[PDB]
Write a protein that binds this ligand. Structure first.
Ligand SMILES: COc1ccccc1NC1CN(C(=O)c2cc(=O)[nH]c3ccccc23)C1
Ligand SMILES: COc1ccccc1NC1CN(C(=O)c2cc(=O)[nH]c3ccccc23)C1
Ligand SMILES: COc1ccccc1NC1CN(C(=O)c2cc(=O)[nH]c3ccccc23)C1
Ligand SMILES: COc1ccccc1NC1CN(C(=O)c2cc(=O)[nH]c3ccccc23)C1
Lengths: 302, 302
């Protein structure tokens, strides 16, 4: 037992991290096969970020202006191109450590592991969710751009995120590996609103099921509710509406604990309206929404 | 910015994980050079755990009874010995992926990353602390024994923990890599008390400094206190007494934020006595104590 915010083992991704420098700007790149993927803002100066014309800025760059280093060895850049907000630097050597991989555009409410890197060197790994407002609550400092988010399915790494920027609320924005930002964000220095940070209801319910599997059962009540009644309370607390598809997704956890999904909704409705009363659930004093039903099942069964 | 429970990149440790089977028992081993380290309870049946005589049980085992598998390849066991609560299985092949390493016995209040493994395959990585009561709050299921805890200092892995068991409170107990348990725990099926789970005060203060660096400043007040006055309140809440050595350790964070250590103690005293009033600090509704002052500096500077 026990329940922690667990990340995937990062080894497969560590073997893909390189340093990319253009002028005075250094950030991280992801080396897969003979291509290095990195944020296109590597070509920008601080002044350029106020109103960058990436097409015009990129024309002043040649292959030899992109310095790519893998550990202590320099890679030779034989091509470059921009795809949405990422650059693809073709190198003359295929990464010998390229794992089996896919590029996926993750859905809001889903989770992934981030390997935070600086100067092409991995520094830490943590788990996060793609919030409904398409931001992540990461931990990224100066030089972290190009760090990636991923999931692992046995031996295949599904890359889903590349880090590009930090927004005014302290939250982070980035793209999928095709260079398309998650959400309405743009790689420019303009204050950008993420919008209401709604709570991932199905994930809160999954985490309440994890708590029950772990013996934390104080919050269970003798009540039930309906989807429509629960959602009237969910709306008030900026929780995502719970759908029948979410109920179906919670099926296995509901059956494992013997607690019907709508009975768990009634418990969550009471927790929202009355609070925790100074009590905790799985070592937390707030309702946690960054664990999917898959994450809970994986962590509670193997 | 941002502050997450961040673990070290696990790649170096993933290359050391093997599966060890003895009879019907399978768990994980740590393969470093030509030795595989694993919990000695791998030799036990469920019945043996009620009152095991490890010396007598181990005499009925020969090298060929320990099946060690590294991925899909079987390693040849050419020796075995017991050191405290670990077995050391000498194999005929040195692990080609053996990183630079040390075995360290971590101090209570310090943190480390755990690579949770099952059947010799890494499943997840998370960060935790060696609690003052020498337990960890991990996430470990059946088959997780032999998973290790470690820290990384550039290219050197300091192994500090090997997983052995789960206690009645849902917390975990284990040994250093010399096989000595942290705390009073024994590898037998008897209900074992961990004692009062005291809060790591210096770590709470480090985390309050992290919150201030991250713009969360609501809890700062116009007060100061003394070590002796603060400790009178700390005792009441089962917090560890704050010493001058802890104040010295918080020196760099105090100076970075311009908030004197005793001024931060006054804020923590008010948080303990009055609560959070429904507010959060770094996305938490309770005072977090599993980040050391080193962890905060590393995550806030690089
Ligand atoms: C003016 O620069 C931009 C403007 C608009 C968009 C992007 C940039 N630059 C990019 C963002 N960069 C960082 O390194 C970074 C990322 C981060 O998540 N948090 C930070 C905190 C402090 C200092 C830097 C960062 C490079
Ligand atoms: C805080 O975000 C903005 C605020 C006002 C206007 C624009 C933004 N967004 C963009 C995204 N940026 C960063 O990633 C970034 C770049 C940097 O050089 N230093 C930072 C320090 C702190 C937080 C972010 C950054 C600037
Ligand atoms: C009766 O066995 C013991 C008695 C005293 C001491 C040890 C054992 N066995 C060991 C402990 N094992 C596990 O696999 C394990 C570890 C864990 O942390 N949590 C669990 C939860 C559920 C089922 C198993 C575990 C093997
Ligand atoms: C809960 O711990 C005890 C309770 C009463 C008496 C003894 C213990 N301690 C020991 C340490 N054990 C385990 O690691 C363990 C072994 C197992 O086979 N199944 C478990 C299921 C749940 C939690 C722990 C275990 C038994």
């Amino acid at each position: 037992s026990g329940f922690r915010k667990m990340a995937f083992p990062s080894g497969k991704v560590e073997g893909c991290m390189v340093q990319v420098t253009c002028g005075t700007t250094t950030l991280n790149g992801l080396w897969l096969d003979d291509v290095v993927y990195c944020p296109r803002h590597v070509i920008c100066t601080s002044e350029d970020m106020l109103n960058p014309n990436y097409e015009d800025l990129l024309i002043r760059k040649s292959n030899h202006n992109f310095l790519v280093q893998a550990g202590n060895v320099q890679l030779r850049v034989i091509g470059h191109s921009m795809q949405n907000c990422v650059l693809k630097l073709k190198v003359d050597t295929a990464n010998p450590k390229t794992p089996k991989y896919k590029f996926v555009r993750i859905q809001p409410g889903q989770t992934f592991s981030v390997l935070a890197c600086y100067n092409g060197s991995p520094s830490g790994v943590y788990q996060c969710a793609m919030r409904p407002n398409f931001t992540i609550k990461g931990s990224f400092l100066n030089g972290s751009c190009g760090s990636v988010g991923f999931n692992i399915d046995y031996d295949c790494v599904s890359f889903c995120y590349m880090h590009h920027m930090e927004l005014p609320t302290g939250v982070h924005a980035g793209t999928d590996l095709e260079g398309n930002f998650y959400g309405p964000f743009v790689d420019r220095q303009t204050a950008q609103a993420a919008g209401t940070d709604t709570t991932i209801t199905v994930n809160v319910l999954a985490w309440l099921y994890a708590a029950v599997i772990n013996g934390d059962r104080w919050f269970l009540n003798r009540f039930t509710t309906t989807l429509n009644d629960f959602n009237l309370v969910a709306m008030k607390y900026n929780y995502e509406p719970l759908t029948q598809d979410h109920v179906d997704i919670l099926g296995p956890l509901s059956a494992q604990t013997g607690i019907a999904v709508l009975d768990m909704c009634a418990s969550l409705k009471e927790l929202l309206q009355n609070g925790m009363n100074g009590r905790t659930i799985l070592g937390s004093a707030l309702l946690e929404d960054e664990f999917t039903p898959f994450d809970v099942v994986r962590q509670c069964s193997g």
